[PDB]
Amino acid sequence: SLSEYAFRMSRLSARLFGEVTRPTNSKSMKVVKLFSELPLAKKKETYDWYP
């Protein structure tokens, strides 16, 4: 829903800030979220829950 100037300017901004450049749907964006954060088990709360 953007013009050519807006689309390429937005795509340029993503390259500058290191965001996703190629067009990606909502489902495949979860891969970015999976590696952007530690898994639930890897969190210090989980494996060190008990003394």
Partner: peptide, 26 residues
């Protein structure tokens, strides 16, 4: 309805590695 355009398929240039690599220092 599938919208495909010439500029939408153009890969963004990796300006960090080539154009602005000299800016990583100082």
């Amino acid at each position: 309805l599938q919208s495909r355009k010439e500029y939408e398929q153009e890969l963004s240039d990796d300006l960090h590695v080539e154009r602005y690599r000299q800016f990583w220092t100082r």
